[model samples]
Target: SWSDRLQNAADMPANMDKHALKKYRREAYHRVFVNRSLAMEKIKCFGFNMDYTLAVYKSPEYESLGFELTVERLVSIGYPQELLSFAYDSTFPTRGLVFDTLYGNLLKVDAYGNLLVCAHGFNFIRGPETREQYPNKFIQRDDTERFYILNTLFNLPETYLLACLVDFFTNCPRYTSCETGFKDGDLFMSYRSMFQDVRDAVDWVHYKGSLKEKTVENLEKYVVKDGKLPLLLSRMKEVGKVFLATNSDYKYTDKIMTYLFDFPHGPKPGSSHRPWQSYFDLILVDARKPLFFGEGTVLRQVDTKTGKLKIGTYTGPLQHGIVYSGGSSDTICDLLGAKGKDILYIGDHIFGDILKSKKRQGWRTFLVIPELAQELHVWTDKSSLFEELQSLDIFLAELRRIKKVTHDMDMCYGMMGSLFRSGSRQTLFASQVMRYADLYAASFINLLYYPFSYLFRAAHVLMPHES
Candidate 1:
């Protein structure tokens, strides 16, 4: 109750009528915006991602936990112990930043892959420095191996950690700074390896380490335990078949979901509590999405008792208490007896969860942008800064210099406002969001705002010279 009240206070005014304020608060915390019209009437199946989608982690706490664990993992390897001194600075990094392995810089690129801003460690890599690496100041994002996109909220810690490590090692006297990367004696260390090390460390934290273990032990700190989750999922089930397709393994999924539904009752406060599995018509774990939408692995059942996949083909009807492993989008379609358009998949990943599913399976997508609630706050509260920034853009258009006017504006969300946008030019992340997600919000609980039969219509956009 205090959390909701605090969140309400952040967005609401001090003065208002009691009843009016209650209605406003209700509409505020739980709301969703539409990019394309979604007819809830037509949707037959609903899907979800586990981590950020369902389990909304506390901002700095969760990311800081990630950074600490990742750093610990790195120290166990061969990295400098100085890394232990580095802390997760929430202000330094924003989601959707790209780490360039070849050049050792954090890039903020626009939709066309044009570099809008570039930073190498603490140093802002300016025009000439950026040009030296990007030539025409553009990148071929197809080179996935060289460029890592920190697109999701889960990747935020390691995203900043990559930059922090680059900055640390570059400034270290022991490591010789070279043209592309740093060299320690005869051995050369490209940012590529450093990036991989951190990446592996994060994976190890999630998989081999105790991130999940720690989370289950203290869910209130790492995960947002909301009674609204059961309310929302139960509502969706009333409309159509609801399912969970998560990349997490069965055992891990069980722990998290059980915690999510740990609330004493169901949708209403007085209602009886139901098993988390009872909310879904089908349950898929280790779905290995993006690939799951493609040619996925064989579908196998999991023994809930053993928390291991059973051998042989999983045949028979979709029943309760049966967990499935690695199945394609087609398998889900066949089991549900629904078409792609009939299903609505909700997730936090822009590419893996949203883009791939929409592109391959033709499922309607609802994206979970955890940062959106805070982003909206900045947008609303900092209107004056935004207006001045827009005015500066017009001046830049006449002068042809195109220098910044929103240094403060960019820092509104983080040190990289350019990650959100540069003037009117949409960042690569922004464009991907617009292209892939049909509906998006801070959380799926926003679905509770409208009734099951509600038809969400997209807002209109006007051309500069046309009606």
Candidate 2:
């Protein structure tokens, strides 16, 4: 009877007309999901963030590189030699997971802060077991001292490293396990202390120039090479003023930008090759965003040739050729002769790029979610499981049955599951995207597919009663 019910449910979707089916199939991957309404015609300038937004990094290879370097940093600072053996597994960690500093557990929480998945190091602490530490299986995520969210792409390696260190100290017979941390002879190493160490090491790896050195040395291995990137910029520049505002310094930005544009020709194959700087109307580095959206530091000019900062704070008209450092959002609006709403700032960072710009300056935001490409694939390929789950919702809600289906759906994405969702609810990460980003896609390059005059529409959101 159950088999018959599932089969009947599956067949119901087949009744849809061919036109709707064709549209759904065609736009599945390319569709830019909208949270808020925005008009392209209103936008006068297009701005970008360099790191993940324009320069997409290849995963596993990139994560492993960061992980190895971070591990080495820890070892140099009195960590155990055994940490060297722990390899970075990209499948093991997911973005937006909250690290519990007190107990050293990685938690997958929903938009409401309800815990969906909890992992104590390498071992998973399921529902009932999770309740032991997480009382009601919910957290006040605003408790920043006790909880740290691994939200950025760069934090992936550190997430795995944290787990590896936790697992290492927990299993080692040499140490005694306490509620907070292990007891090393004459030393009580708290979980919070270990977390701080990992955090410091990760920060050091990036700020100290180790990660940049490795990335620059092996450009092909780390950064994703795409010819379309140039074409996209060229198209945008033709219609509106295009600019770059990156947290990276001028030297690092130049190296990476040069690599991105190192093709035989320009946007077109037959066209002459142009320097990466030529595509943008304005260029900025060390933007210090989130702060950049607010009252930022004094602006300084960077000598393009030497890649060095010019003496004293810059006090002149903004020029096209010169690169700038440490400017505020209002600086760009004022200099570019555009209002905050007239500029569309595209970037990958939720807080640094999207949230603050939209909130503080009212800049139209396009979020770049590189993981969406794969997430879209899983969603399209697994329609049956989704339909079955929908049918189960109409019938009596079966907790075990729903869990089984949702788990299967989640596993299709990764070990930690979908970045946008967890079980029946949207993730906290997803909520942030909806609230902050006007438009989001797997890549910002998706903009090239749409005409500059296109008016992107937001999908209708329905309340529970309406559905």
Candidate 3:
């Protein structure tokens, strides 16, 4: 069964490290095809959702509060830090992770990917008003699931707290007075790898207030405000029909889209110029996607004026009104015209947005990996160094094969032999694994710099505050 799963899926070039960190497959995929054109065809009815799908932006406000800074901010507010602790290792390197252990011990995975180290950091202070409010148990790196495996095989150095802290603070805005600083619908999405690299350091939940605070406050800064997507909206309006299907509630969704596309008061493009107003034929706001393909939910009248959703059983020219609860494929088929290959659904969630739809219903899928795209540019720039780094893995793998053969030979491979050589190979594996992040976002980003310049429309860079 294990072999079968690998056989049916797309191809991912094997790396010596890939074999070493097989446990992390839950988040990684072996790519069969790198480019979309070579992957498959027969897909049309282009559709997309808002959030992270069409408009991509990185929020710096998110990072201001969701990390070690949150602990400091909390302390400034007179809150006790007895139970809280920073989940990080300056020397080990990490990218993304949340530490939820109720103890005070540092955790590190050993060379073979075993949990190690139990050092505690940070001293907690209690508040005068509540003795029971503070936790007797302090946090340590050992408190999270991050210690369970070695994901990248090499470049363990890059796994430190930077990106994890960025992601934690971005995803959860509750920790700081961030709400007072930034706007809502603002974001700082990144490649999942960045998050995975140093997960133990982030606290999305406890720091959520900070994230929401900043995001809520800065919500208006990134607004497109007029439902205008440059010029393509007009070009598409002339030919293929367009629309939106998303899970975000209508008010938030509309608010976000309006700001992202320059809707309402923004200028619309002309025929000779680029047409931008035609962002969608009909926006199925809050329409739960993937479910829009499987669950056959019903569609109802949506009061555009108030975003109030109503039930409906009828289907026709879309009535230029909002609706909800419409069931799956058949109903949507009637609405969009049932040519499986014609409708292309674009989304950010790789599994939820693309794979599920493509696998279950065969609709065209455009996976919008905002984070992945960002990281790629940051990674590949150091290719020459990385190429040398990569070759080391080949050398080690070759050494391993030799060691295995020598170890199994009929005669201890001739007395005091090959064992010494095997030891040498093991040393190389450890050295490479700890020295560099072979495929880090920084590494990957460098690889994508050239193509991204040509393919990506959104500007990269996660701004900490609105200019």
Candidate 4:
């Protein structure tokens, strides 16, 4: 019965209205299939998941956070901060896996889940893993945002317990176990007691709420892209409607939207209707997602002046230039005054944005995965092995040409060798790919960015390119 609880929510649906094949590698079974929907229905009510979806992050900034956090943690335990250089390496691939406990010892692991080495600041050796398993937890790609947040926010803690909590997360994998299994916002609470005993320890969430706030603020700066989003907002508005529902706080949502729509990277202000600003019919921030799916929650209109939520009972197209929180099935039905298929919600987070919308409420779902660009970028970049992968297609073409001159048996042998040599390229590329496949594969969808998908039916795009 427990299997039923985790019974792949997509099984019952006949077809997926849309699948974000781009967001996942092959392992993401969730977005693979199409669920039933009516004919030619354009999705309305576009929702966006703020972090890593609507906005993109320049991950290189994490190097500073990593170095600062590491240096701070080291110094607290009687080590010299100056002794450790602030360096972060993405070429190493697993940037956050390195860990130094309160004892000033650090460690590392290889992809096969083996203990590779141990050191402080990528150099100083403490002691190696005498045991077989890796010292710190291997942060897999599919791993949730929470654990990553722990590593991202590391070293800012003012107490020893927060330090200890970081220790557990640094060593545990996310497998429906303690890391993600705990209730939301509770993962670090278990170590609060440790801080009390340290006496000088302080509660970060309460005491340095501003740090947490600013950290989130800094995160906003990283994620919210400043400029016109790569969306045909005006064109889409002419044919279909749009709406926004995000888990972000309302005030923060406005700030994020300002950057994303009005103040993006380049010349945007003078441009007309910069996609997000003038396009959205409604904006629901702090909509308190996933929970907003449950039946008992009521939709409320929030007053912009006083920051108060009032009972909202009306239904029709949502009021423009208004900020609201907490939407309900009935509330949505009343607002759009249309069937569920008429509404489309585009988001980044799988559980809160897409899964909940599709499964609980019947809204059409569009998932925007910011990481998709990186995956394709990686795919096309030249490695000698990647060049060999391209050779496979040529090999197949050669076989087709030679088939007229050879027997089927010879052709089969030729095909095997062709694919075998090609498959090695595939294997090498795949090995490189699978290391982050769980984070990838879902990215296979949305062929828009990939030029091959448009040119000659693409070497990718498994089946059914629109004619």
- Best-matching candidate per TM-score: 2
Model 3 spans > 4 angstroms off: 1-42, 63-217, 220-228, 263-278, 311-317, 323-326, 400-467
What would the TM-scores of all predictions be? 0.91, 0.92, 0.48, 0.49
Alpha-carbon RMSD to native, per candidate: 3.7, 7.0, 17.9, 14.7
Residue 149 in model 4: shift from native, Å? 11
State each model's CA lDDT, in order.
0.81, 0.84, 0.38, 0.40
Off by over 4 Å in 4: 1-41, 62-208, 211-226, 263-277, 310-317, 382-467
Candidate 4: C-alpha lDDT: 0.40
TM-score of 2: 0.92
What value does the lDDT take at residue 276 in candidate 3? 28
Give me the displacement of residue 371 in model 4, in angstroms.
Answer: 2.6
TM-score of 4: 0.49
lDDT of 4 at 172: 38
Across residues 103-194, which tens digit of lDDT does each residue of candidate 1 receive? 88888889888987789897887778788778999988768988888887778898889888888988899999876689989899888887
- Where model 1 places Cα greater than 4 Å from the true spot, the runs are 1-29, 395-404, 459-467
Q: What is the C-alpha lDDT profile of model 4 across 386-423, one tens digit per residue?
A: 44444655787687423222222212222111111122
On lDDT, the candidate that comes out on top is 2
Clashing residue pairs for model 1: 410-417
Query: Ten-residue segment with the worst summed lDDT in candidate 1?
Result: 1-10
